Design a binder for this molecule. Structure first.
Ligand code: HEM
Ligand SMILES: O=C(O)[C@H](Cc1ccccc1)NC(=O)[C@@H]1CCCN1C(=O)OCc1ccccc1
Ligand SMILES: [NH3+]C1CCCCC1
Length: 454
């Protein structure tokens, strides 16, 4: 039975002012490097424990002992994502109901149906880059976000955001980004009810109303048209939970669509951005990935079956998820009193945070080369210890979008590697911006066409 270390305190504010930073996950990573596999983090009225080692996280991932917790960030996101899958408690009726209805929409089999829409958007990205002038560069996270937002719009509800036609965001996305920014800004606020935050509160209620009004109108328009497009909205309007025999109600469908738009804007775009960063920083790896793309993608338009054969590209994506998992933390609570690692007693209801980027740097798992980008680490999943690699979370509350994200990212990265050579023309210095997720801010490259027709 050991006493847990704790980072520096600020009197009555305890550890809260350590979150007064634009890069809180990276700050928590530095604290984990100093204090080790577990540390206590206290704010007024709140205690959590940050876990960094596979030794402790493999126990945290036991669903008999721990369930998903809503962190303070997720409680703030729940003000607009409601009881959608990501912001619901496992015990709320609408979690298992929506999970049972939506699982078939998110399977490998479903990806065969989404593939044509994903190719539509991927071809728009390749055409944009083919059309750049010699003196121009690519803004990588900006273009990857155009692609992933457009993909979830088309697969989600047959809507074209037309992100490659504009600089100005869609009014929904203006409100969503500003609401996500307010939810994250709220975390550090010592005096949230100070009148200096009244305008923030007013703008937040306005942004919630915009997102609700626009998505409610999408649902109403679809019910009115009667059209049966093969998209998530059709599946939710027609689907019945096998257990209850009930469909989702229109309010819950709105929360699911808001949730999918957050995910499609925030997550896969970061994965693609980090993958291209690591490829241009590791030219021998880029060469091996480019050779696979050329060997496999023998048709002007990739097929579903061809994407499944981009094995090394899949390993490149896993190794980018290892070093910079774009959804970098999840939260758990103890279902009953239990002892963690034979050393740390917990009481029922006690909270844990899993710091995924630290788990992924555990040298006892990956060896001394842990900071190196080596996709070959993923050649044999049976050679990777249990619960060593958790970029999509854990158990029944793992990412429902995992197959969707990896299909889109594999397709797009395969097509990028087939069609272009890349240059890190600025010798870009990694600068990681934090929202709900991680992205490489200011990452730019030049692309030289291999002049292969679509
Ligand atoms: C690289 C891309 C992505 C990553 C790294 C990622 C990561 C995660 C993680 C770590 C969780 C667990 C959260 C927690 O325990 O609190 C999660 C849950 C979830 N993700 Fe993703 N995600 C990605 C893409 C997507 C996409 C594309 C969608 C949907 C279009 C999506 C929808 C969801 C949903 C709905 C949940 C909640 C599942 C549930 O509890 O039933 N994600 N994701
Ligand atoms: O939101 C939290 O509770 C904690 C930070 C905190 C705040 C107040 C007291 C004590 C701790 N959040 C986090 O540690 C991380 C880092 C910043 C945001 N965050 C988080 O979990 O965001 C939600 C999220 C993102 C991705 C996947 C699941 C959930
Ligand atoms: N995919 C989930 C985790 C990251 C934020 C969006 C929902």
């Amino acid at each position: 039975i050991k006493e847990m270390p704790q980072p520096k305190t600020f009197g009555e504010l305890k550890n809260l002012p350590l979150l007064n930073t634009d890069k809180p996950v990276q700050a928590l990573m530095k604290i984990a490097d100093e204090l080790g596999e577990i540390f206590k983090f206290e704010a007024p009225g709140r205690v959590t424990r940050y876990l960094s080692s596979q030794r402790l996280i493999k126990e945290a991932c036991d669903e008999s002992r721990f369930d998903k917790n809503l962190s303070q960030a997720l409680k703030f996101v729940r003000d607009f994502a409601g009881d959608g899958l990501f912001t619901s408690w496992t015990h709320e009726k609408n979690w298992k109901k929506a999970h049972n209805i939506l699982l078939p929409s998110f399977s490998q089999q479903a990806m065969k149906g989404y593939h044509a829409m994903m190719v539509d958007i991927a071809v728009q990205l390749v055409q944009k880059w083919e059309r750049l002038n010699a003196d121009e560069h690519i803004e990588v996270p900006e273009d990857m976000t155009r692609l992933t937002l457009d993909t979830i719009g088309l697969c989600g509800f047959n809507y074209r955001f037309n992100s490659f036609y504009r600089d100005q965001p869609h009014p929904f996305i203006t409100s969503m980004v500003r609401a996500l920014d307010e939810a994250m800004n709220k975390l550090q606020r010592a005096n949230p009810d100070d009148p200096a935050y009244d305008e923030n509160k007013r703008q937040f209620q306005e942004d919630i109303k915009v997102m609700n009004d626009l998505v409610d109108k999408i649902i109403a328009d679809r019910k009115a048209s009667g059209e049966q497009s093969d998209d998530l909205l059709t599946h939710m309007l027609n689907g019945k939970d096998p257990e209850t025999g009930e469909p989702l109600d229109d309010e819950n469908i709105r929360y699911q669509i808001i949730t999918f738009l957050i995910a499609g804007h925030e997550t896969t775009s970061g994965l693609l951005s980090f993958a291209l960063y690591f490829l241009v920083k590791n030219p021998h790896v880029l060469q091996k990935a480019a050779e696979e793309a050329a060997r496999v993608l023998v048709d002007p338009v990739p097929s579903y079956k061809q994407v499944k054969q981009l094995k090394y590209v899949g390993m490149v994506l896993n190794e980018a998820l290892r070093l910079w998992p774009t959804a970098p933390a999840f939260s758990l609570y103890a279902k009953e009193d239990t002892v963690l690692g034979g050393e740390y007693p917990l009481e029922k209801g006690d909270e844990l945070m899993v710091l995924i980027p630290q788990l992924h740097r555990d040298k006892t798992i990956w060896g001394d080369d842990v900071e190196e980008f080596r996709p070959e680490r993923f050649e044999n999943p049976s050679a990777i210890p249990q619960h060593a690699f958790k970029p999509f979370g854990n158990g029944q509350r793992a990412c429902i979008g995992q197959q969707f994200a990896l299909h889109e990212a594999t397709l797009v990265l395969g097509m990028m590697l087939k069609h272009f050579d890349f240059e890190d023309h600025t010798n870009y210095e990694l600068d990681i911006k934090e929202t709900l997720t991680l992205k490489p801010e200011g990452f730019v490259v030049k692309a030289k066409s291999k002049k292969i027709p679509l």
